[PDB]
Amino acid sequence: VQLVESGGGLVQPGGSLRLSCSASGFTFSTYSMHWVRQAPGKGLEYVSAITGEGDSAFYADSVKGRFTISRDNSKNTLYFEMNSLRPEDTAVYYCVGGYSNFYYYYTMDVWGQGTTVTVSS
Amino acid sequence: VQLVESGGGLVQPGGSLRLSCSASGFTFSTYSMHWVRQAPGKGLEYVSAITGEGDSAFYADSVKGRFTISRDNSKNTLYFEMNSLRPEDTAVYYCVGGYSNFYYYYTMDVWGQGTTVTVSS
Amino acid sequence: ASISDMASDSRCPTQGEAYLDKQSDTQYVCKRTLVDRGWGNGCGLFGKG
Amino acid sequence: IRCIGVSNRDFVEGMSGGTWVDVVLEHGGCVTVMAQDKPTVDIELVTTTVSNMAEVRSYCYEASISDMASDSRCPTQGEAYLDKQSDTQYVCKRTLVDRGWGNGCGLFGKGSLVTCAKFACSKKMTGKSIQPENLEYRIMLSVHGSQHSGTDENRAKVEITPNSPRAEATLGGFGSLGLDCEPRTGLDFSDLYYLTMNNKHWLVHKEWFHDIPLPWHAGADTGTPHWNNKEALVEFKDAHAKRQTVVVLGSQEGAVHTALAGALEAEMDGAKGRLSSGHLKCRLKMDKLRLKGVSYSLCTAAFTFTKIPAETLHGTVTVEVQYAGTDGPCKVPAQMAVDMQTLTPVGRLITANPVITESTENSKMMLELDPPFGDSYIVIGVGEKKITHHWHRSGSTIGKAFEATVRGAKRMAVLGDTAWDFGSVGGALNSLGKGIHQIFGAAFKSLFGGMSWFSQILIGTLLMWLGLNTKNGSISLMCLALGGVLIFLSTA
Amino acid sequence: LITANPVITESTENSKMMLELDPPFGDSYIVIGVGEKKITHHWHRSGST
Amino acid sequence: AVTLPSHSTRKLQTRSQTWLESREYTKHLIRVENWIFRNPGFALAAAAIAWLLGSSTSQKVIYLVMILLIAPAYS
Amino acid sequence: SEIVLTQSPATLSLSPGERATLSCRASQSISTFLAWYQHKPGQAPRLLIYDASTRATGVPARFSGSRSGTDFTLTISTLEPEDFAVYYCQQRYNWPPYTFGQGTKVEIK
Amino acid sequence: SEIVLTQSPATLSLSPGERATLSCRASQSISTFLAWYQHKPGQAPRLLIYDASTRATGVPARFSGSRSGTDFTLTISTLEPEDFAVYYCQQRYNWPPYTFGQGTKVEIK
């Protein structure tokens, strides 16, 4: 049971980026996935979520419109395609997963190591 | 109960050959016959078949169109007239026979020694 | 008329229907029927093929 | 647990001295089985997988046409013949055309015109056969007792196939629930094909996947396909004498979707097809079930409501308690009481014997219970530290009996004769009713039962008038059918 | 049970045998074995007498 | 093609909802109401024909209803 | 609008072995759906408690959680050196809008 | 299309006296109609097992066959020196498109 995140790097304002999160050790389809970011010297911010089956997706107001969460249950991979990036999005992003029987609810979760996304300036 | 095969030989591409398989020791009419070939460095390939009474015949897609199976129950002989030979047909051919009360089905079979057919340009 | 190389195909009591690839040729007369099949002939089920 | 919030659960109580109870499991809801001195078990049917289906007769719902051609003949010659009529990949149509002396052939009668066009089907649908063997059910069961509201000794999963219809669910410390089930007779998978169009899969009835007017192949897709219909999806529209034209009808995937109605959806994983709407009947041999908690000394420290009081849809009450002072594996005193002066236990506690199992510091446990209809108090705790909660239940026993009859009527309308097996410890009255219901159901399904909602509402109103004013002795007969027919509408 | 009595005559490690039988019309179980190892099968027949 | 038989004849009965369960009642009623609304005079024609058939009043009303059902479907 | 969680102590300074108490207050009623996480610099946040009183798998018994109305409390009886980190409360109520508290840092005074 | 058979390892290196296990996986359901053949270079292939468990006439008892769904297994308990050859599985289901597997070779280790 592990989540390995990748895709972080440097990007220009207004640019685009795609972050990936590979899951291992469990039935990926039964796990609702979530993206939580932490800005430097700031608290955790729950930004996005997707159900186990990919039916529905949820975006926080701070990211609603620019970012798109998706998942492939055959490749066991979660994707967070973030476009139109602003300097305010420079943060460490973690993908978390929890066994879900309802749209997004979960009790015990599993976290990845996180990946840094830095806008140039 | 034996099957003696003959007629194999070297031939040019596009040549025509006729293979014979004489049956002994059993009622030839009650045995469905089959031709199975093995190319050098390849597994056994089941290519052709004919019912006990000669009513119906089957050819595999790899040979469908060029090869013709037939049988003479009075002379106890199976024939495999192979025309339009190609280098891919270079192989050892075995004639097999099995007691059948249905078109081609059989449980216990009898094999001949095989004959080599070489198609080289 | 004169006839030539016959061929045939069978199916399980519960599969589709038989299909010879020589049914897509307008030089062959083809007929479809039901045949008793099962457990001796080659597929485990006993209806009409 | 696991059936608290299902809102379509029913309670199966009592048995022949602890021997066994018959129970029908359905995909929608679940069954909580409670015995005399045995832990209450919640049982639910989860998924039905079908395996290794065999393709049968795939259709085409989107045709494409290709290089047309045509031929015409002397008003007085034979008939037109294209050499492309000897090809099973072309659609060809023959008609009569006005011809002569202007077109090139001196005579004036009708000619003969043949037009041919090559056919190609893109993305045709496919149905597959389902044998009632190689069909697997997955039943999930859980136990009440020590689990808080949120290898684990309290839940089990049982796979049931026709090749192994009987299984035992080993609940550690509770013993094992024996379970004999009938997988073949569940939903009559001997008339239902599995149908796919484009990544959308349905359950379809035979006699609807054979009376479809679309170009159909048959089974083995080997090389250049051969489509039997060859005429329906191509329209040979002809102007009198002067022209012949060939068009294709368009894409048909919306006309099939509306033709599908009353057919169940399904979803496919790999080679297997999961249906989520089914029906299964298992006999529950619960005579190896024990009670873990007995011989424990009842806990006396304190109890605090964590989740306070929660009412389910059926009347029961769920309570989540937290235990403060560690005793150990230890019994929870709990009851429903009115007149707190004399704690006389009223109502029924539908949870076996609540026991906390942890011994760390503070533990959580969830029980539920069936309180009387009047006002009452949930009393938890031993003495001078008893937490009491005030709980009010709505409806008198008459309404409960009425709702029970409504549930029974709906279960019958859904299941047929099988409904007589739900609480069927088994007598002679039950068996007699089941037999006469089988006979009447066969008659009704053979006479009616080729009708839909609106059609049967119509024929029901008609026979209502008929039986109302017939004045003979058959009136009752008519009237009877009407209930049946009308009840079948007002329960969907 | 149509077959007269079903006896295994070959004993080397594993043997094969085929029997047939005429079941009642309701649901039923084919029971083959004695105790604790009697594999069973669920079988359903269609039509009344 | 043109016919495409409806599956509601063989409706699979179970706890779960079927493919298009929401649309059946409104479907048939909508077709009938629309056809009658577009062609009003056929109501008079059906009234006359039903009046010529059937002795009692109930028979004539049933004939009228059956005509007004069978015409919009062109059955 | 959205639910907000307010942790009272911005930063807490305690010696090893001392009792540690952190409080998280919700803007509205939430029955028991509150979680407590421990986050160390250069590490993934670690789930400590869910359902406001239930310890996650493998969490030592020293950590305890309690609730009173809208006020939740995380208590560490015997502070260990590896316990000095940031602690967050997370909302697990009805819909995915989930707010982490601003966090409280437990420092070695 | 046609049924295909897959023999897992394509090569088995074992020493005389060891236990040999070969597997054959079919692309679709075939009830018990699987045959196992032994082929030695310079000799005609020899039928070992038909109906997936029944030994042909004269086959020694050390060869056994088992089936589970679509997975068939040929077991050689006590490997003999003359048992090192190529082994093929053949599907006998319902009509002639009959096919063999790619073959697995039992080599002396």
Side-chain angles (χ1 to χ4, degrees):
Chain A
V1 182
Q2 193 183 357
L3 304 176
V4 182
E5 338 191 12
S6 56
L10 185 65
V11 78
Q12 311 300 326
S16 298
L17 189 48
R18 174 172 151 276
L19 276 63
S20 298
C21 176
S22 182
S24 57
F26 60 93
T27 307
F28 185 66
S29 65
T30 69
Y31 267 62
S32 69
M33 306 306 298
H34 316 256
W35 283 101
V36 177
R37 72 184 180 186
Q38 178 189 200
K42 293 296 179 180
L44 298 175
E45 183 180 14
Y46 186 93
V47 300
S48 176
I50 189 176
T51 79
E53 211 166 12
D55 303 333
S56 186
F58 161 78
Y59 305 102
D61 284 339
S62 61
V63 307
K64 186 172 185 176
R66 302 173 296 174
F67 300 175
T68 297
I69 185 175
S70 58
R71 67 187 295 162
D72 192 323
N73 297 8
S74 60
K75 294 193 298 299
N76 293 22
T77 312
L78 176 73
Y79 311 85
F80 195 60
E81 209 164 20
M82 293 177 182
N83 306 272
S84 300
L85 303 196
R86 294 188 176 192
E88 291 76 5
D89 303 340
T90 292
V92 187
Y93 288 75
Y94 306 86
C95 54
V96 325
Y99 170 76
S100 175
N101 50 263
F102 194 71
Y103 284 97
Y104 304 84
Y105 185 81
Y106 66 98
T107 58
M108 298 190 59
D109 56 351
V110 181
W111 290 64
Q113 75 288 352
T115 167
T116 307
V117 175
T118 303
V119 180
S120 65
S121 185
Chain B
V1 185
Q2 289 177 343
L3 305 180
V4 183
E5 336 192 15
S6 59
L10 174 57
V11 77
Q12 319 302 326
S16 297
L17 194 51
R18 184 174 179 182
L19 273 59
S20 300
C21 174
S22 178
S24 56
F26 62 93
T27 305
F28 187 59
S29 60
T30 65
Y31 266 66
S32 73
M33 308 302 296
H34 317 256
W35 285 104
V36 175
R37 72 181 181 183
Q38 177 186 205
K42 296 296 182 180
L44 303 181
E45 185 181 11
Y46 179 95
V47 295
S48 177
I50 192 179
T51 79
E53 213 166 9
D55 308 330
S56 171
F58 162 83
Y59 308 104
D61 288 340
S62 59
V63 309
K64 185 146 196 170
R66 299 172 293 160
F67 299 175
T68 297
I69 186 176
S70 60
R71 64 187 299 163
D72 187 307
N73 297 14
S74 57
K75 298 193 294 295
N76 286 22
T77 317
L78 176 71
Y79 307 98
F80 196 58
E81 218 162 8
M82 67 174 282
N83 301 271
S84 300
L85 294 184
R86 301 179 178 172
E88 295 73 13
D89 301 334
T90 293
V92 182
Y93 289 76
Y94 307 91
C95 53
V96 325
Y99 180 89
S100 185
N101 78 323
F102 201 71
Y103 284 93
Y104 306 95
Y105 181 78
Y106 66 99
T107 56
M108 297 192 62
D109 57 353
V110 177
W111 290 65
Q113 73 286 351
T115 174
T116 309
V117 171
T118 311
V119 184
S120 178
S121 60
Chain C
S2 296
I3 218 173
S4 182
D5 52 307
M6 297 88 75
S8 39
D9 190 310
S10 72
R11 206 57 58 90
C12 299
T14 301
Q15 307 293 299
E17 322 180 28
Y19 172 86
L20 265 178
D21 70 319
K22 301 180 176 183
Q23 289 188 331
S24 63
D25 190 358
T26 47
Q27 224 153 338
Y28 287 76
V29 175
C30 295
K31 178 71 179 311
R32 196 184 308 259
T33 39
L34 307 173
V35 146
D36 294 347
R37 295 222 59 177
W39 212 272
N41 308 324
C43 295
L45 295 174
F46 277 121
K48 297 265 187 177
Chain D
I1 277 75
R2 216 184 157 283
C3 286
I4 302 307
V6 174
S7 78
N8 190 19
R9 86 165 177 178
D10 61 356
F11 305 81
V12 173
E13 181 179 7
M15 44 199 324
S16 312
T19 42
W20 58 275
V21 182
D22 289 345
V23 149
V24 167
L25 305 178
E26 284 184 305
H27 257 262
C30 47
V31 172
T32 89
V33 191
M34 45 182 308
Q36 182 57 49
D37 297 327
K38 307 187 171 306
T40 298
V41 178
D42 297 16
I43 309 168
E44 191 183 42
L45 183 61
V46 180
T47 55
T48 70
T49 55
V50 198
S51 52
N52 52 85
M53 297 160 298
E55 190 154 0
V56 178
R57 188 188 278 209
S58 57
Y59 292 98
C60 287
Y61 64 77
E62 192 173 309
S64 295
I65 224 174
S66 181
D67 49 314
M68 295 90 75
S70 52
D71 187 306
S72 44
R73 212 57 59 91
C74 180
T76 302
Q77 312 285 289
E79 324 183 34
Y81 167 79
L82 281 174
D83 56 324
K84 299 181 181 189
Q85 290 187 323
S86 64
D87 190 359
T88 47
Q89 220 159 338
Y90 286 84
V91 207
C92 295
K93 176 70 175 307
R94 196 186 311 264
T95 37
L96 305 169
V97 137
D98 273 355
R99 178 162 266 272
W101 208 307
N103 314 329
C105 295
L107 263 174
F108 282 120
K110 297 280 192 182
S112 98
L113 183 76
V114 165
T115 53
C116 294
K118 185 174 185 177
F119 190 91
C121 183
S122 300
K123 65 244 40 180
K124 61 298 178 300
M125 60 180 180
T126 59
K128 314 186 180 187
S129 65
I130 293 173
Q131 293 93 8
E133 71 202 25
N134 60 68
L135 159 70
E136 178 182 42
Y137 302 90
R138 177 196 315 278
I139 300 178
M140 278 274 191
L141 48 98
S142 72
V143 204
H144 287 230
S146 50
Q147 315 166 40
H148 84 282
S149 174
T151 61
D152 71 0
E153 194 228 0
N154 287 142
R155 312 200 302 274
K157 175 179 62 61
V158 175
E159 316 277 341
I160 288 190
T161 61
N163 207 21
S164 75
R166 193 166 48 97
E168 272 205 0
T170 297
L171 311 166
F174 290 153
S176 56
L177 193 147
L179 202 157
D180 314 13
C181 208
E182 309 184 358
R184 281 184 182 265
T185 180
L187 192 56
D188 190 11
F189 294 89
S190 301
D191 307 312
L192 305 188
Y193 289 163
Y194 198 76
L195 172 69
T196 59
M197 298 197 56
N198 47 347
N199 289 337
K200 294 175 190 168
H201 319 256
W202 289 270
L203 266 184
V204 139
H205 189 256
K206 301 189 314 172
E207 314 154 2
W208 182 89
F209 188 76
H210 269 70
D211 320 342
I212 283 190
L214 291 173
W216 55 274
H217 193 34
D221 183 1
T222 62
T224 58
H226 163 239
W227 303 104
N228 185 14
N229 209 311
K230 298 292 180 65
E231 181 179 0
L233 217 54
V234 167
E235 166 84 286
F236 280 98
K237 56 179 186 178
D238 193 28
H240 59 90
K242 179 59 180 180
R243 284 180 59 91
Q244 300 180 1
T245 37
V246 204
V247 299
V248 289
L249 308 197
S251 192
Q252 290 297 330
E253 183 195 353
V256 177
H257 273 98
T258 76
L260 287 158
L264 292 171
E265 308 196 42
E267 39 185 10
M268 194 162 78
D269 50 339
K272 296 184 172 187
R274 305 199 332 271
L275 295 174
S276 171
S277 56
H279 156 222
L280 192 54
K281 168 189 181 306
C282 307
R283 166 173 306 188
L284 306 167
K285 290 179 172 176
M286 45 187 312
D287 61 71
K288 293 178 161 304
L289 278 175
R290 317 179 302 100
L291 275 187
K292 193 176 189 177
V294 197
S295 69
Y296 288 163
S297 189
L298 295 174
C299 295
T300 79
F303 287 90
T304 63
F305 295 117
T306 61
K307 182 177 181 179
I308 328 180
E311 177 176 12
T312 56
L313 294 88
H314 302 270
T316 67
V317 184
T318 71
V319 180
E320 181 172 11
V321 175
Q322 168 165 349
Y323 187 61
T326 44
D327 184 299
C330 186
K331 210 187 304 177
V332 164
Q335 79 186 56
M336 302 290 320
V338 77
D339 175 68
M340 194 81 53
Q341 190 61 76
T342 68
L343 307 182
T344 296
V346 311
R348 183 185 56 186
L349 190 154
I350 294 169
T351 59
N353 68 316
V355 163
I356 52 203
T357 322
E358 309 296 336
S359 172
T360 59
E361 177 46 45
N362 278 266
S363 301
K364 277 179 131 180
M365 68 94 46
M366 191 187 68
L367 65 99
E368 82 162 330
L369 62 80
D370 190 355
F373 285 138
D375 303 342
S376 179
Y377 295 101
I378 309 178
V379 184
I380 299 185
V382 180
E384 295 174 352
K385 287 184 167 302
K386 319 185 302 291
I387 55 175
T388 62
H389 187 276
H390 176 63
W391 211 85
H392 173 71
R393 201 173 177 183
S394 302
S396 59
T397 90
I398 306 305
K400 181 179 181 181
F402 174 74
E403 292 183 353
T405 55
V406 169
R407 277 205 334 270
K410 283 187 175 181
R411 170 150 53 245
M412 284 179 57
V414 170
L415 291 185
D417 289 345
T418 320
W420 284 87
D421 286 337
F422 193 76
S424 205
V425 175
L429 301 185
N430 178 274
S431 175
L432 178 66
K434 188 174 187 299
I436 70 177
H437 190 195
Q438 275 198 19
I439 282 134
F440 283 171
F444 184 90
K445 183 247 192 176
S446 171
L447 240 60
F448 312 96
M451 306 183 173
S452 57
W453 189 90
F454 188 73
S455 166
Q456 58 188 0
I457 228 181
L458 283 180
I459 203 174
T461 301
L462 175 68
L463 304 190
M464 273 188 88
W465 175 260
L466 228 63
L468 213 58
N469 83 321
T470 59
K471 299 178 184 180
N472 196 311
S474 73
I475 47 181
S476 177
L477 296 186
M478 315 301 296
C479 280
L480 289 186
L482 301 177
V485 164
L486 257 308
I487 289 187
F488 290 177
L489 287 110
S490 307
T491 62
Chain E
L1 295 174
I2 164 60
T3 312
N5 58 324
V7 174
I8 286 165
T9 60
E10 306 286 346
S11 68
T12 60
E13 178 48 44
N14 282 267
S15 292
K16 265 185 158 180
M17 66 141 307
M18 190 184 74
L19 56 93
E20 76 162 322
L21 62 80
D22 183 3
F25 285 147
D27 299 299
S28 185
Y29 289 110
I30 307 181
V31 171
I32 296 181
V34 182
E36 182 184 323
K37 294 183 170 185
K38 43 171 172 301
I39 58 153
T40 65
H41 192 271
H42 177 55
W43 207 88
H44 173 59
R45 204 173 178 186
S46 303
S48 62
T49 69
Chain F
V2 183
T3 79
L4 268 172
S6 186
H7 191 98
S8 58
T9 300
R10 289 301 135 91
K11 174 171 178 295
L12 276 55
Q13 198 55 45
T14 176
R15 272 311 205 283
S16 186
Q17 291 194 16
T18 55
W19 167 229
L20 284 182
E21 211 188 28
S22 317
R23 309 205 175 182
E24 297 205 38
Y25 355 96
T26 59
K27 163 217 301 185
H28 278 300
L29 288 185
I30 274 182
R31 184 177 58 182
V32 165
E33 287 180 1
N34 167 41
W35 189 89
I36 289 185
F37 165 67
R38 287 301 180 178
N39 306 38
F42 188 81
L44 274 61
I49 298 182
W51 178 272
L52 295 189
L53 292 164
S55 306
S56 59
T57 297
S58 314
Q59 287 182 334
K60 301 201 272 74
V61 177
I62 293 184
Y63 273 104
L64 170 61
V65 170
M66 284 177 43
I67 295 292
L68 281 188
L69 284 179
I70 197 178
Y74 311 130
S75 178
Chain G
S1 181
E2 317 301 330
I3 308 178
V4 298
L5 301 187
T6 298
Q7 308 190 204
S8 35
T11 304
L12 187 57
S13 302
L14 298 173
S15 304
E18 297 181 347
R19 200 179 193 89
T21 296
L22 300 80
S23 81
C24 184
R25 167 170 289 180
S27 60
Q28 71 183 45
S29 181
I30 294 169
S31 61
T32 190
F33 302 108
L34 198 280
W36 286 99
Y37 289 80
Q38 176 184 65
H39 185 214
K40 300 188 180 183
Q43 297 179 193
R46 179 194 177 191
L47 171 63
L48 285 187
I49 290 184
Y50 65 95
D51 286 343
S53 64
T54 304
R55 301 158 190 163
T57 299
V59 177
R62 310 121 54 187
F63 300 94
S64 60
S66 63
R67 173 235 179 187
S68 64
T70 62
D71 310 326
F72 297 76
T73 301
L74 174 61
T75 304
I76 310 172
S77 61
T78 303
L79 260 184
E80 292 291 332
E82 69 278 20
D83 296 4
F84 294 93
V86 192
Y87 291 97
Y88 295 97
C89 47
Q90 184 199 11
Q91 188 45 54
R92 303 289 191 81
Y93 202 46
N94 181 34
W95 222 239
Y98 296 151
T99 46
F100 290 80
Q102 45 273 59
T104 292
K105 179 177 180 57
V106 178
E107 194 213 27
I108 312 181
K109 185 180 183 301
Chain H
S1 180
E2 315 289 8
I3 301 180
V4 302
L5 305 186
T6 303
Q7 307 191 205
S8 32
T11 292
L12 200 61
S13 301
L14 295 178
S15 304
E18 301 194 39
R19 165 189 179 91
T21 295
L22 304 84
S23 70
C24 187
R25 197 268 174 179
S27 64
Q28 71 181 41
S29 179
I30 56 183
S31 61
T32 200
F33 300 96
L34 202 285
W36 289 98
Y37 291 86
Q38 174 188 66
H39 185 203
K40 303 182 182 180
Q43 296 179 175
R46 172 195 182 186
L47 173 63
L48 285 183
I49 297 184
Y50 65 98
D51 291 335
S53 79
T54 301
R55 308 157 190 167
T57 302
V59 176
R62 59 176 175 272
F63 300 100
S64 178
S66 62
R67 174 234 173 190
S68 62
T70 63
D71 305 320
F72 297 80
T73 296
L74 173 61
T75 301
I76 306 178
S77 59
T78 301
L79 264 180
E80 299 298 331
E82 70 278 21
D83 299 3
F84 293 94
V86 192
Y87 290 87
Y88 294 97
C89 48
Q90 174 190 31
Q91 149 261 339
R92 305 269 191 84
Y93 191 64
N94 192 31
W95 214 239
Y98 300 137
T99 43
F100 296 89
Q102 46 275 57
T104 300
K105 176 171 176 52
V106 181
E107 180 234 3
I108 294 179
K109 172 184 175 184

